[PDB]
């Protein structure tokens, strides 16, 4: 696999340390749609609105299987640690027009 999952379930935004790497989700967009990190970094999505969203990497991207994150309600967070260099696309399962990508170097 190319990523591990710190928490299978969504968790409180407030637990995210200031300075952590964060992709915000507001107004039906991933607010940082092309994110550059380094191998080993933890990326955290935080949902800033009431419409639930997730991040969804299709089969083959982060591993054999799809990685379909849990739906996040308002002020909930979800994280993935990227363990291998490359570029990984993802979208929001119910909102397929919402697309982003992580570039791991
Ligand atoms: Cu969504
Ligand atoms: Na995947
Ligand atoms: Na997580």
């Amino acid at each position: 696999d190319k990523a591990t999952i710190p928490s299978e379930s969504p968790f409180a935004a407030a637990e995210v340390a200031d300075g952590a790497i964060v992709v915000d989700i507001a107004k039906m967009k991933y607010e940082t749609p092309e994110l550059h990190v380094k191998v080993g970094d933890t990326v955290t999505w935080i949902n800033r609105e009431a419409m639930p969203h997730n991040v969804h990497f299709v089969a083959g991207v982060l591993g054999e299987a799809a990685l379909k994150g849990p739906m996040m309600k308002k002020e909930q967070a979800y994280s993935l640690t990227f363990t291998e260099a490359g570029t990984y696309d993802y979208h929001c399962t119910p909102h397929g027009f919402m697309r982003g990508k992580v570039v791991v170097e």
Side-chain angles (χ1 to χ4, degrees), residues 1 12 21 28 31 34 39 47 53 60 70 76 79 87 94 97 105:
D1 280 20
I21 297 167
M28 308 301 288
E31 246 176 359
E34 180 186 80
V39 178
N47 182 9
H53 301 291
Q76 288 201 303
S79 298
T87 289
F97 59 87
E105 313 196 316

Side-chain angles (χ1 to χ4, degrees), residues 4-11 43 77-80:
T4 63
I5 306 182
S7 172
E8 298 284 344
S9 294
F11 58 88
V43 174
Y78 181 67
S79 298
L80 298 174

